[PDB]
Design a protein around this ligand. Structure first.
Ligand SMILES: COc1cccc(C[C@H]2CCCNC2)c1
Length: 358
């Protein structure tokens, strides 16, 4: 099984909740483990060191004090290998930041509507997915600064999209939100594939035409049958889904009946098969994420009283619970380092907790 120890803790001076944490899984052979935190109008980088040390690297303080960053996601430059950090929040502005300098190199506006989550495509580092308060999902190409596609309408989400994930190859997305529903959006169609090819052939300095985005109004599957409240986290586990609402369970399920293939599912599909549930407590509050290590061998989720749950997914039909006496605030998000040796928890009181695998 797995064991961890609290080697360090710190607190950011703004004292506003920290809504996001991400280790850089794109970092090179030799350089140190770096993680980013988001909360208030701040983006902060941290270097993990020996003897449980958490070294401050640099901060980005947005010019707008009314900005509230809710999410971050790392990528890299496909030509140079250099890491980049995407950040967004309440203002509905995506900012692409260079971690070496904290220079905002690129900024995107889909609308002026709050962005809840950012995800990068697992196969194309340029393809950025944003989920918004305006009930839509947006797919961006950050190499050419183009809006490839808008996912939503009457048949899309009927409320705020709180989370989304790409499958293993980035052939499809599963989004979820306040409308209690989880929706599938296929992005490997002849149409989306050509839209991505075109996004790359666009240059506004060499043409008068605008970039025409795909307007996808109909999901490929939809369900309101897994949770009976706001679904605030979703993640693919192969062809299966892990999702949670505020009902003290992470649910493992799949579209259709037990033996149905996800690629054979038609949009009209009325069934869902639940495969299991990860039960816990004191996580009845909205907006609490779960996280997985690189290998998807581990599942971590923080609760509203500062307790951190960890599960081994390699078990037959097990849990472990991480507590410290000075950790009482709600853990909004957790992040495992690429080598699964460090687990970082960020809280509502702007505190950062370091758990090392022993
Ligand atoms: C940390 O967990 C989550 C889960 C879902 C969404 C978000 C962004 C929120 C911030 C609070 C108001 N709604 C948007 C955070």
């Amino acid at each position: 099984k797995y064991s961890f120890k609290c080697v360090n803790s710190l607190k950011e001076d703004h004292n506003q909740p920290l809504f996001g944490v991400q280790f850089n899984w794109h970092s090179k052979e030799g350089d140190p483990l770096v993680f980013a935190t988001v909360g208030s109008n701040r983006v902060t980088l941290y270097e993990c060191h020996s003897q449980g040390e958490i070294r401050l690297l640099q901060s980005y303080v947005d010019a707008d004090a009314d900005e509230n960053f809710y999410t971050c996601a790392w990528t890299y430059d496909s030509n140079t290998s250099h890491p980049l950090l995407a950040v967004a929040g309440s203002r509905g502005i995506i900012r692409i930041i260079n971690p070496i300098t904290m220079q905002c190199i690129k900024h995107y506006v889909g609308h002026g509507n709050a962005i809840n989550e950012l995800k990068f495509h697992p196969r194309d580092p340029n393809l950025l997915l944003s989920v918004s308060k305006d009930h839509a999902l947006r797919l961006w190409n950050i190499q050419t600064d183009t809006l490839v596609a808008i996912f939503g309408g009457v048949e899309g989400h009927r409320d705020e999209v709180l989370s989304a994930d790409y499958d293993l190859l980035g052939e499809k997305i599963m989004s979820c939100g306040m409308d209690h529903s989880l929706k599938l959006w296929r992005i490997n169609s002849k149409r989306m594939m050509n839209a991505i090819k075109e996004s790359y052939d666009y240059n506004p300095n060499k043409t008068n035409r605008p970039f025409i985005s795909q307007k996808i109004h109909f999901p490929d599957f939809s369900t309101r049958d897994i949770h009976r409240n706001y679904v605030d986290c979703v993640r693919w586990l192969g062809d299966l889904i892990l999702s949670k609402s505020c009902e003290n369970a992470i649910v493992c399920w799949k579209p259709g009946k037990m033996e149905d293939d996800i690629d054979k599912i038609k949009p009209s599909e009325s069934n869902v098969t639940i495969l299991g549930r990860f039960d816990y407590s004191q996580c009845d509050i909205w907006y609490m994420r779960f996280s997985m290590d690189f290998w998807q061998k581990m599942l971590a989720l923080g609760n509203q009283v500062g307790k951190l749950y960890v599960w081994d997914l390699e078990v037959e039909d097990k849990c472990t619970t991480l507590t410290h006496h000075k950790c009482g605030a709600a853990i909004r998000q957790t992040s495992f380092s690429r080598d699964s040796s460090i687990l970082i928890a960020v809280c509502d009181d702007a505190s950062i907790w370091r758990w090392d695998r022993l």
